Design a protein around this ligand. Structure first.
Ligand SMILES: Cc1cc2nc3c(=O)[nH]c(=O)nc-3n(C[C@H](O)[C@H](O)[C@H](O)COP(=O)(O)OP(=O)(O)OC[C@H]3O[C@@H](n4cnc5c(N)ncnc54)[C@H](O)[C@@H]3O)c2cc1C
Ligand SMILES: [Cl-]
Length: 381
């Protein structure tokens, strides 16, 4: 009946395809790559997955995160440590940290790999009275009634929707991330533990199967001559003097499976749709990962997208309502992440010092309340 073309088979595209199908819309999913660390899916994200029929993925693969702590970088002592039980009670779902690999594999399995066309890199969309068409680098094309551009932070379709080409803004820090086996010599196995100091941080969080998702953050200029070959040396020098658990992590990680990402965001857009085409996921909003809401927001995007089509077939009207519901939400998330990034990574070391001070006096009430505000502001409340 109604055909949606979905570009991108990441969290966004697969969630959108699942949501559109829930609403009786047939989706063909296209993905540029020919084949193939972790994210923390907070309760708003979890509730969305559950709404989408993918609740089992979260529950099964979400690591046992039960409490959190911040530790002094030099001494390794707790500044604050507390349970997240109240977070779970107030929001109705637990936070589910999950390895990217497993999450991708499970979502693809849920949708169906044979219903995704791989090696299809979109370059262009065109809309006429009757529908929309896309072209792929391999020379092929495809037509449908609706187009979902979930093609990522470097989205090729975004400029057609906005009429100009947004540029990524370097956020001023570098993130190294990966997975290691759990060891209490590093930190507790059911805890989100972060060492903070010097505008840097080192974080450990449990995913499934007795592993930690880890990440190192260092404020630095973009473009340094660093990669997996210099990796262990880079970390050793950026985290010189840091408590023993940090040195132990640097020694346990495998540089060859560790990722180095220069963190960017994009100034928020005031538009998400044009005619039969909607931006979704990173294509429509690209945030620093500082509050862990990028993947969550893509899932939220999909829930709303599905909702607006549940009882209409007026595409332009449905997308205008999608845009109305999502635009201010994702603007706030991007900006809130940016603020958190600047505080955590020493944009103004005094504010950052002030923050460390707050962490020493922190009972968890404040942190949990802030987390709830972000979560409860999502579409499923
Ligand atoms: C370091 C880091 C930590 C993060 N931590 C968290 C977290 O803790 N919690 C959380 O919720 N989120 C987190 N995120 C964000 C989350 O990873 C992303 O927001 C989410 O994966 C975005 O999904 P997406 O489908 O929109 O984009 P992508 O995953 O980038 O998918 C887009 C897909 O489109 C394909 N594609 C690109 N161009 C084309 C084209 N021209 N034609 C066809 N296909 C194309 C790509 O191959 C890709 O598969 C983190 C991100 C980073 C970088
Ligand atoms: Cl994020």
């Amino acid at each position: 009946h109604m055909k949606a073309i979905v570009i991108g088979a990441g969290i966004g595209g697969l969630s959108a395809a699942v949501a559109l199908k829930q609403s009786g819309i047939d989706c063909d999913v296209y993905e540029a790559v020919k084949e193939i660390a972790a994210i923390s899916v907070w309760p708003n994200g979890v509730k969305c997955m559950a709404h989408l029929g993918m609740g089992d993925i979260m529950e099964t693969f979400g690591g046992p995160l039960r409490r959190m702590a911040y530790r002094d970088f030099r001494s390794g002592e707790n500044m604050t440590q507390f349970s997240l039980a109240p977070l779970i009670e107030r929001t109705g779902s637990r936070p589910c940290p999950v390895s990217r690999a497993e999450l991708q594999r499970e979502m693809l399995d849920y949708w169906g790999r044979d219903s995704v066309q791989f090696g299809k890199r979109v370059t262009r969309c065109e809309e006429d009275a009757d529908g929309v068409t896309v072209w792929f680098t391999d020379g092929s094309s495809a037509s449908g009634d609706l187009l979902i551009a979930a093609d990522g932070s470097h989205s090729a379709l975004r400029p057609w929707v906005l009429g100009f080409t947004p540029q990524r803004r370097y956020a001023g820090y570098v993130n190294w991330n990966g997975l290691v086996e759990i060891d209490e010599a590093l930190a507790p196995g059911d805890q989100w533990t972060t060492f903070v100091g010097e505008g840097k941080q080192v974080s450990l969080m449990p995913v499934s199967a007795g592993r930690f998702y880890f990440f190192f953050d260092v404020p630095l200029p973009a473009g340094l001559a660093e990669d997996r070959d210099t990796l262990r040396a880079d970390l050793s020098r950026y985290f010189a003097g840091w408590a023993p658990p940090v040195q132990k992590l640097i020694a346990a990680l495998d540089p060859q499976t560790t990722n180095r990402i220069e963190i960017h965001d994009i100034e928020p857009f005031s538009r998400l749709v044009r005619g039969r085409v909607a931006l979704l996921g990173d294509a429509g909003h690209s945030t620093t990962p500082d509050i862990g809401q990028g993947g969550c927001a893509a899932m939220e995007d999909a829930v709303v997208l599905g909702a607006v089509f549940r009882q209409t077939r007026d595409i332009a009207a449905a997308l205008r309502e999608y845009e109305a519901q999502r635009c201010d939400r994702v603007r706030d998330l991007v900006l809130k992440a940016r603020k958190r990034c600047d505080i955590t990574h020493g944009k103004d070391m005094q504010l950052t010092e002030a923050w460390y001070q707050e962490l020493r006096e922190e009972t968890g009430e404040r942190i949990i309340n802030g987390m709830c505000d972000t979560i409860l502001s999502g579409p499923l409340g």
